[PDB]
Design a protein around this nucleic acid. Structure first.
Ligand SMILES: [Mg+2]
Ligand SMILES: [Mg+2]
Ligand SMILES: [Mg+2]
Ligand SMILES: [Mg+2]
Ligand SMILES: [Mg+2]
Ligand SMILES: [Mg+2]
Ligand SMILES: [Mg+2]
Ligand SMILES: [Mg+2]
Ligand SMILES: [Mg+2]
Ligand SMILES: [Mg+2]
Ligand SMILES: [Mg+2]
Ligand SMILES: [Mg+2]
Ligand SMILES: [Mg+2]
Ligand SMILES: [Mg+2]
Ligand SMILES: [Mg+2]
Ligand SMILES: [Mg+2]
Lengths: 187, 227, 141, 68, 104, 141
RNA sequence: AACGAGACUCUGGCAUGCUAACUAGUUACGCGACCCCCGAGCGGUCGGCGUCCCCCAACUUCUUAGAGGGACAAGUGGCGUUCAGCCACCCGAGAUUGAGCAAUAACAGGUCUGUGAUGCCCUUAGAUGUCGGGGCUGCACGCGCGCUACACUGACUGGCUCAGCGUGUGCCUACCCUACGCCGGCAGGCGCGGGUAACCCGUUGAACCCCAUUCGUGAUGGGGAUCGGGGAUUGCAAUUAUU
């Protein structure tokens, strides 16, 4: 620990990416362990510099969207913080493993391109699998807590939980299944 | 005031003064080859210098014109009597001052001459006096009722970059005739006088130049001669 | 301990009770019908707002001498929403800040400075340091 | 990108080499000073570009001879 | 006797201003006048941004003119006669030179 | 015998100067302790160097930091870079060389911008748009 | 061979190397003083806080601004007719900051309402060259650039804590930026000072952001149109509401 940063409280060892493709594109442990999801981060400089970014800072960045949320990142770090504690209560598992499983369960691996309403099926790159997973997971929390009495932190944890426990009750998994079904039709 | 004007207003006011004096002396000494003023505020006095090509015409008979000029410059700008002091001077190599050639061509055209003949005469003069290049444009109703433009270029001429703030002299002059105005534009390139003041120093940026030495001998024998 | 070594949001909270524990620091009469700045919409929630603002003004005078009313009203100035037109920055209320500084002088806590302005007395630095020590020893910082 | 030198740089470097062939070496920070002292380049960026092409030419003249 | 005197120069051209200030420093130091080095105050930048066209037609382009005012000051401890001796020589360009008799 | 060193850090027009001097602990920025710098959401950000080199390296020095410029987040990075740039400079003048190149590598492996500032600055606005790259809305018909 | 491109100029990034500074500072202690034990201790000595006061202290790290330096596809590995060059990497403040300037030829583009630039035509004393009043703002409707919102990633009320580019007393022309004391809920008023400015406003206590209260999915405490009544200031004059 004196040389192992957790998150303040969440240990980042004993977290297993159980995919062979999506690893090397999910920067959780052993070199990307950091105290906070907030760095200067000149990650948008070259083509693939983005995969070296910690995944929690890839979610913190994507969560601040739709107009009156742009640049409000210190508001977007406390959201992830309050959500990880909700996740640890509702389940009991290390809240980073739930995030990794949710990212794995919601990135589509087949998709379709408009060509020549003609579409043709193609297979998704791993980086695009991670990007689509993050975007889908954030949009679900956004649309779930837009006029509810529930808070953006309860619904983000709801989304992550229903995604890691593949249930089709999360917005991200309904959307994945549609893209892969529409792509299977156009096969 | 008890506390005088601030530095910003002071410098802006100096510039406006110089511009108005230059306009005034332009509108008057045109027929005498006026080519610029140099306000040199010296201890105890405000000295103004007028370069020109015909200095006798500037001062006149015993200096009546020059004294009238001192008089008006002292009346209009509010100077204490005895301060404004004015000098005339002759410009060397008049063929390289654009304003002089522009006004010369304007009066040569105002007196009746084939516009091509006049433009080619001034081109000849400007290039003969020593100049990397010149360019004279005349725009207006030349030979008809529809306007046109006639451009006479010669030698080298640059249009782009910083080296154009020096290395070129530009002059634009209107000339009114029996039917509408004509526009005269003269541009000249100064021929890089090193350490001199007929052109600029500091040669063109893309002008790397190499020197070649000698006195190196290949025949050699290891002799150590003493002194 | 010093005043700078402790969380200031609890320091203001303790000093407000200190001020509203003595009976001194006579408040104005218009305390219940005043908006506190041009750019506000309602009266302050907290009924005993004058003691909190006196504590705030005192802790502000501890940190910079010679403040005077025209700066207290800049220290409490914020944003004004002009309805349909864009928002701008706005000053606090001179009457409130002036009455607060006059009520602090009525406690020997502050004095009018040598250059024009207001400043803490030696007796005010002591009352702020004692409350700082009390706060530090309370929360075991 | 760019990094394609211009004829004003290449001709200057070729002349500098063809006259002072024996003063020029293989390192850049010395060729820079040599070309600074033997010629008159009216800029510092141009000086660096000329001295950087001189080095790339010298690295070739040590092999088979160039044709300019 | 001795006096604390302040010279101030200001102009729109750096080369000639620095040349004048340096020659003044030298020509005053050679007589052991205990000069105080030049103090470079911030450079002022007047800016005027105008429309490029008369008449209001065309694409909406603009021109950005600007003037720059450089300022320096020198401090000397010397009799005023020597100050007027040294300050009134070799003033080539349109730089200003102001002398004040007591500033310290 | 005096023994001290002053260094600086920058991030987006926000300078932070740190003065390191032989003493005991006491990393103090602007007179207040390091645990009470305004945004406490980034509390773990200006604690990283000491949480990286251990409390024992900051045991013979007394660092005092002063900050001025930028905003609430550009100053956290200034402080966090300045104290590291200070401990690395104090270890290379009054201690051995390997003793400084060890902590230099410990710091520069976990994160750059702890020793090397980054050159990103705001870009200028151009006429014809609300910012540097955006343009106003085009309108045919 | 010439122009344009490039070169060029301004700008942003780096120098614990140089030059040198009460109209900028740092550190030191000379200090002196306030305060609290907050530490050993006693409370003193040692310390801790200070935009509290001084130095004919030492210095230039931060500030200022001048001179030089520094980057060249220079080093290393691939791909290249082994040429011009391209990709990757080490070292590095940086390996692709941003603007200014810009050619020949042309358009029945815009400007006679910028001009004591201007040709021709018109008017010239019952004037098309001056004062008072009204208009340029009128409203069934069509269109363009935009501001504020549709709320809980929020509104409200308190507390806390950070900028940079600028401008500032006007000649005809009469008006500038404001400190601090008092008075008033507020807009605002009275009284006395500083500044022609790195000197005074000013250490420019900016907003979003940060930390705690109240609200609770209801066109609601979201939103702030429309309209009634009252109070100030600028001005010679406010109605068709100037602010
Ligand atoms: Mg060219
Ligand atoms: Mg160019
Ligand atoms: Mg913007
Ligand atoms: Mg050819
Ligand atoms: Mg190679
Ligand atoms: Mg490196
Ligand atoms: Mg460029
Ligand atoms: Mg063109
Ligand atoms: Mg016109
Ligand atoms: Mg006409
Ligand atoms: Mg008009
Ligand atoms: Mg009239
Ligand atoms: Mg009228
Ligand atoms: Mg109109
Ligand atoms: Mg438009
Ligand atoms: Mg608020």
């Amino acid at each position: 620990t004196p040389d192992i940063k957790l998150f303040g409280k969440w240990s980042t060892d004993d977290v297993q990416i159980n995919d062979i493709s999506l690893q090397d594109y999910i920067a959780v442990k052993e070199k990307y362990a950091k105290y906070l999801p907030h760095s200067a981060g000149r990650y948008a400089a070259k083509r693939f510099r983005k995969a070296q970014c910690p995944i929690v800072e890839r979610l913190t960045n994507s969560m601040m969207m739709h107009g009156r949320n742009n640049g409000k990142k210190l508001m977007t770090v406390r959201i992830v913080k309050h959500a990880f504690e909700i996740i640890h209560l509702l389940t009991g598992e290390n809240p980073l493993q739930v995030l990794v499983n949710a990212i794995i369960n919601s990135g589509p691996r087949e998709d379709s391109t408009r060509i020549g309403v003609r579409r043709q099926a193609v297979d998704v790159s791993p980086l695009r699998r991670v990007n689509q997973a993050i975007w889908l997971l954030c949009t679900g929390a956004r649309e779930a807590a837009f006029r509810n009495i529930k808070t953006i932190a309860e619904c983000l944890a709801d989304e992550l939980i229903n995604a890691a426990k593949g249930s089709s009750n999360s917005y991200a998994i309904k959307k994945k299944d549609e893209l892969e079904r529409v792509a299977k039709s156009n096969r | 005031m008890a506390v005088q004007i601030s530095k910003k207003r002071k410098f802006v006011a100096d510039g406006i003064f110089k511009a108005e004096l230059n306009e005034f002396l332009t509108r008057e000494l045109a027929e005498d080859g006026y080519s610029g003023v140099e306000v040199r505020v010296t201890p105890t006095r405000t000295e103004i210098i007028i370069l020109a090509t015909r200095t006798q015409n500037v001062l006149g008979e015993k200096g009546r014109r020059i004294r009238e000029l001192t008089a008006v410059v002292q009346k209009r700008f509010g100077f204490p009597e005895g301060s404004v002091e004015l000098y005339a001077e002759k410009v060397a190599t008049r063929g390289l001052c654009a304003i002089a050639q522009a006004e010369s061509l304007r009066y040569k055209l105002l007196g009746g001459l084939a516009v091509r003949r006049a433009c080619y005469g001034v081109l000849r003069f400007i290039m003969e006096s020593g100049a990397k290049g010149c360019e004279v444009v005349v725009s207006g109703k030349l030979r008809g009722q529809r306007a046109k433009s006639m451009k006479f270029v010669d030698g080298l001429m640059i249009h782009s970059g910083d080296p154009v703030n020096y290395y070129v002299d530009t002059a634009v002059r209107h000339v009114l005739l029996r039917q509408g105005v004509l526009g005269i534009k003269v541009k000249i390139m100064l021929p890089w006088d090193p350490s001199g003041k007929i052109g600029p120093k500091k040669p063109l940026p893309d002008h790397v130049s190499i020197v070649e030495p000698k006195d190196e001998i290949l025949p050699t024998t290891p002799i150590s001669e003493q002194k | 301990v010093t005043v700078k070594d402790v969380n200031q949001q609890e320091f203001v909270r303790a000093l407000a009770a200190f001020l509203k524990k003595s009976g001194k620091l006579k408040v104005p009469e218009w305390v219940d019908t005043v908006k506190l700045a041009k750019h506000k919409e309602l009266a302050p929630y907290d009924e005993n707002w004058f003691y909190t603002r006196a504590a705030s003004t005192a802790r502000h005078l501890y940190l910079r001498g010679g403040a005077g009313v025209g700066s207290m009203t800049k220290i409490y100035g914020g944003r004004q929403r002009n309805g349909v037109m864009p928002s701008h920055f706005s000053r606090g209320s001179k009457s409130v800040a002036r009455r607060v500084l006059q009520a602090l002088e009525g406690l020997k806590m502050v004095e009018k400075d040598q250059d024009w302005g207001r400043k803490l007395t030696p007796q005010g630095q002591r009352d702020l340091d004692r409350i700082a020590g009390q706060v530090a020893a309370a929360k075991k910082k | 990108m760019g990094r394609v030198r211009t004829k004003t740089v290449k001709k200057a470097a070729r002349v500098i080499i063809e006259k002072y062939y024996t003063r020029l070496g293989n390192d850049f920070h010395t060729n820079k000073r040599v070309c600074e002292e033997i010629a008159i380049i009216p800029s510092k960026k141009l000086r660096n570009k000329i001295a950087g092409y001189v080095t790339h030419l010298m690295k070739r003249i040590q092999r088979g001879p160039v044709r300019g | 006797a001795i006096h604390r005197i302040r010279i101030t120069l200001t102009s729109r051209n750096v080369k000639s201003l620095e040349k004048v200030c340096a020659d003044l420093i030298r020509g005053a130091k050679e007589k052991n006048l205990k000069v105080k080095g030049p103090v470079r105050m911030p450079t002022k930048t007047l800016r005027i941004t105008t429309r490029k066209t008369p008449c209001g037609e065309g694409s909406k382009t603009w021109d950005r003119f600007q003037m720059r005012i450089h300022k320096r000051l020198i401090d000397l401890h010397s009799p005023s006669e020597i100050v007027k001796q040294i300050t009134s020589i070799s003033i080539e360009p349109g730089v200003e030179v102001e002398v004040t008799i007591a500033d310290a | 015998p005096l023994q001290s060193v002053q260094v600086f850090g920058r991030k987006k027009t926000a300078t932070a100067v740190a003065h390191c001097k032989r003493g005991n602990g006491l990393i103090k920025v602007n007179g207040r302790p390091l645990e009470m710098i305004e945004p406490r959401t980034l509390q773990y950000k200006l604690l990283e160097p000491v949480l990286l080199l251990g409390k024992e390296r900051f045991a013979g020095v007394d660092i005092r930091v002063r900050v001025k410029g930028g905003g609430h987040v550009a100053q956290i990075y200034a402080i966090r870079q300045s104290i590291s740039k200070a401990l690395v400079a104090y270890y290379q003048k009054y201690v051995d060389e390997a003793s400084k190149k060890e902590i230099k590598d410990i710091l520069i492996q976990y994160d750059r911008t702890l020793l090397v500032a980054d050159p990103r600055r705001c870009e200028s606005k151009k006429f014809g748009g609300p910012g540097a790259r955006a343009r106003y809305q085009k309108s045919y018909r």
